[PDB]
């Protein structure tokens, strides 16, 4: 029934604090834990007054988890559930996975085994990491790694924030992301992806603001995510379990990575304008300028979409708005796939931050999907890697951290067959 969550890496933690915020916000549970089953699949009714979170936090520098235990919400989690390794983060996979990251893992696991026990027939762990980091790429790599073995019998949906197409940060980023992909690939169930840059566009083009603090992108994913777990694990006219996803969403064992998209992104101050039609939002979903991912459907044929709706929506409206789409053709779906549209309908409309910059409509569409499109995104990220590896660039930083020419070269070959995979499962009939 439930779904634990492990927010790994400063980022996965910032995004975590965010997604975690939106939560209580739409569940009437002040930062003090108290509100005045349903949603029990994400919150445990500990003591007789509060609602201790149902997740954990893993960063190797204290800085970021520290800030959580300062700002209201400080009261929300258990002093315990926020894991730290005073040591060093290191923007390098190796160190975070092998060398350092190792020391903590046990302890980390312990919670996802201590928190996994306390519950009642769970469904999986929503993992939150930032592909191109040290604690986010490496560590998790083995966290998800140690999970796929300790609970192979569950769902492993990892929600990632993969490398901005041109606006990356770390100098090595690809090293860290070609490595988190190959090690997690054979361990995840469904990997959701939200592109940091391609989200900015949305903040520039669909909300207008050249002042987007990280704290915003977080509010956004913090939204799209709320549409995944939160509301879905919440009763409705067309419920969709976590398993449901991976089933209706992955055509093949590769921990396939769909893309997250939201429909109503419109800025407060617009807040009064006449609302958008069920048809418009539906249509907005097929626009490559509103998908939290720089993977513009440049050719990538969709192969399965899970249209999660929430708010006031008439099933016919959908079983029509989608019909219209199924026949737009310029939206070309894979061949071997007749119908690939999982319509998920929830009741409770979205819930926008009291005064951030999100419109606040009475219905939204968080559609996610597997698109032969990422054939690109992976490509462009793989190429990166080579260029540097081709010269070993910052290689001495990993080797000296318990890695080898193996893990790199052999994780490169890995993704290679991910460029062929995402190519074969499509483009051909």
């Amino acid at each position: 029934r439930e779904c634990i969550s492990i927010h790994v890496g400063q980022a996965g933690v910032q995004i975590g604090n965010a997604c975690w915020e939106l939560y209580c916000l739409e569940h009437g549970i002040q930062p003090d834990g108290q509100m005045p089953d349903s949603f029990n699949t994400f919150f445990s009714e500990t003591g007789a007054g509060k609602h201790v979170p149902r997740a954990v936090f893993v960063d190797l520098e204290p800085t970021v988890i520290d800030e959580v235990r300062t700002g209201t919400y400080r009261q929300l989690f258990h002093p315990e559930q926020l894991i730290t390794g005073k040591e060093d983060a290191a923007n390098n996979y190796a160190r975070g996975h092998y060398t350092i990251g190792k020391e903590i893992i046990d302890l980390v696991l312990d919670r996802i085994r201590k928190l996994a026990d306390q519950c009642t027939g769970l469904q999986g762990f929503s993992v939150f990491h930032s592909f191109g980091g040290g604690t986010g790429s490496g560590f998790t790599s083995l966290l998800m790694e140690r999970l796929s073995v300790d609970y192979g019998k569950k769902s492993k949906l990892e929600f990632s924030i993969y490398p901005a197409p041109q606006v990356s940060t770390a100098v090595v980023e690809p090293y860290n992301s070609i490595l988190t992909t190959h090690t997690t690939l054979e361990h995840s169930d469904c990997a959701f992806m939200v592109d940091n840059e391609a989200i900015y566009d949305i903040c520039r083009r669909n909300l207008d603001i050249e002042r987007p603090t990280y704290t915003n992108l977080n509010r956004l994913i913090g939204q799209i995510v709320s549409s995944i777990t939160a509301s879905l694990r919440f009763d409705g006219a067309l419920n969709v379990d976590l398993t449901e996803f991976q089933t209706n969403l992955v055509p093949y064992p590769r921990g396939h990575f769909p893309l997250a998209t939201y429909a109503p992104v419109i800025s407060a101050e617009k807040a009064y304008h006449e609302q958008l039609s069920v048809a418009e939002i539906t249509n907005a979903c097929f626009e490559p300028a509103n998908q939290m991912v720089k993977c513009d459907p440049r050719h990538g044929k969709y192969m399965a979409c899970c249209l999660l709706y929430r708010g006031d929506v008439v099933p016919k409206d959908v079983n029509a708005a989608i019909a219209t789409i199924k026949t737009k053709r310029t939206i070309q779906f894979v061949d071997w796939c007749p119908t690939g549209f999982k319509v998920g309908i929830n009741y409770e409309p979205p819930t926008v931050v009291p005064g951030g910059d999100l419109a606040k409509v009475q219905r939204a569409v968080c559609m996610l999907s597997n698109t032969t499109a990422i054939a690109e995104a992976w490509a462009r990220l793989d190429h990166k890697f080579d260029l540097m590896y081709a010269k070993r660039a910052f290689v001495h930083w990993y080797v000296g951290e318990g890695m080898e020419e193996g893990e790199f070269s052999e994780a490169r070959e890995d993704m290679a067959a991910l460029e062929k995979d995402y190519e074969e499962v499509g483009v051909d009939s």
Binding site: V167, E210, Y214
Partner: protein, 426 residues
């Protein structure tokens, strides 16, 4: 994490006073006082440079190595001079002769053990050690010789912890000594083979950058030092602060050194505007990259425009958009594709702290690993040969128990070091 500064020689020492003059204020630590910190964040990470004893006395964890009393007795008899625990002062009342050989083989070699002793007392302080900061000048005894030894020993004791080296490579135009290339070539040699991050500063690259980028007409040493110390604060200490995207010595090291030599960088500060007037505030950001990436403004002597870069690390520290930061860096990488080396798709290593330099709104330390610094070791190496050839003031070395093959060694080594660096400029 932690680090333990090292004030080798007079210069390296004089600068200590300025590096600590600053850093302290950038951490609210009065002479012997405690943390008056205007904020509460300038404390959660101090450890990196201090130690807890009393409860108001966080003492700088550095070492003061020098064979000339008067010096440390000027640094210890002035302003912040009374914050270092006396145990820190590893003096050598001997004759601090200006000979690399006199402070590396004969005179310094003795005072060494009584140093390592402390460098261990400080290392085994507590928590986890990161590396050691080293200040000195490659143009004297207690600096190049004895300080270059201090490291050769340090790097045998903890080949794990890092070693940043702040060297005052012999300025061109006019040298502040005569054998200079002797004391230098000999110390660079030791550097290229022990420390793994060196930040070379030039007393005259500073003057310039201090007399034209700061209409400052009377740039006393204190100043130069002050400017330098400004950069070494942005580097270390800084990153030991929070940030949207923070790094730390290693990141800096593991993103800046493509090839094991150790390679030397060239630091550059961001807001470098004259006091009153200039206070243009044109610091939105394009203004900082405008700064940092220009020729002048590179504490080094050589000019970047004279050779590609291998790596760059804009360690910014002041609230800004990971977009207007990550972005700018790009155009910069494309407007100058010419010099920025290609076999590295993204030379630049964007780093981003949060809290800025106490009184400023936005700054950004620059740590460049350009191939341009080839044209400096060349210089040095030249001066050597031109004088080695005639064994100029060599008797002051040999007569101190040295070798005619020792000088040969260094030059070559450091001379080859020039070679290699070109292997990438092409």
């Amino acid at each position: 994490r932690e680090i333990v500064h090292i004030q080798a020689g007079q210069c390296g020492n004089q600068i200590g006073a300025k590096f600590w003059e600053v850093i302290s204020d950038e951490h609210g630590i009065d002479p012997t006082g405690s943390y008056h910190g205007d904020s509460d964040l300038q404390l959660e990470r101090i450890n990196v440079y201090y130690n807890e004893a009393a409860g108001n006395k966080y003492v700088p964890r550095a070492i003061l190595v020098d064979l000339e009393p008067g010096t440390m007795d000027s640094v210890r008899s002035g302003p912040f001079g009374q914050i270092f625990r006396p145990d820190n002062f590893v003096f050598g009342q001997s004759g601090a002769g200006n000979n690399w050989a006199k402070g590396h083989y004969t005179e310094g070699a003795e005072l060494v053990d009584s140093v390592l002793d402390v460098v261990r007392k400080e290392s085994e302080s507590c928590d986890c050690l990161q590396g050691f900061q080293l200040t000195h000048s490659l143009g004297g005894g207690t600096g190049s010789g004895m300080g270059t030894l201090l490291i050769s020993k340090i790097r045998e004791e903890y080949p794990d912890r890092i070693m940043n080296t702040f060297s005052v490579v012999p300025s061109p135009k006019v040298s502040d000594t005569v054998v200079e290339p002797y004391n230098a070539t000999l110390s660079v040699h030791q550097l290229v083979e022990n420390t793994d991050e060196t930040y070379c500063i030039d007393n005259e690259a500073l003057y310039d950058i201090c007399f034209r980028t700061l209409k400052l007409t009377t740039p006393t040493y204190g100043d130069l030092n002050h400017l330098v110390s400004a950069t070494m604060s942005g580097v270390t200490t800084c990153l030991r602060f929070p940030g949207q995207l923070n790094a730390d010595l290693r990141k800096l090291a593991v993103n800046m050194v493509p090839f094991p030599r150790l390679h030397f960088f060239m630091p550059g500060f961001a807001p470098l505007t004259s006091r009153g007037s200039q206070q243009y505030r044109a610091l939105t950001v394009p203004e900082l990259t405008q700064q940092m990436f220009d020729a002048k403004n590179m504490m080094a002597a050589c000019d970047p425009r004279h050779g590609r870069y291998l790596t760059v690390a804009a360690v910014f520290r002041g609230r800004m958009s990971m977009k207007e930061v990550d972005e700018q860096m790009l155009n910069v990488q494309n407007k100058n594709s010419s010099y920025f080396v290609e076999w590295i798709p993204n030379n630049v290593k964007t780093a981003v702290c949060d809290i800025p330099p106490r009184g400023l709104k936005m700054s950004a330390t620059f740590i460049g690993n350009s191939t341009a610094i080839q044209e400096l070791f060349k210089r040095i190496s030249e001066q050597f040969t031109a004088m080695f050839r005639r064994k100029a003031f060599l008797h002051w070395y040999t007569g101190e128990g040295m070798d005619e093959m020792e000088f040969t060694e260094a030059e070559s080594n450091m001379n080859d070091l020039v070679s290699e660096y070109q292997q990438y400029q092409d």
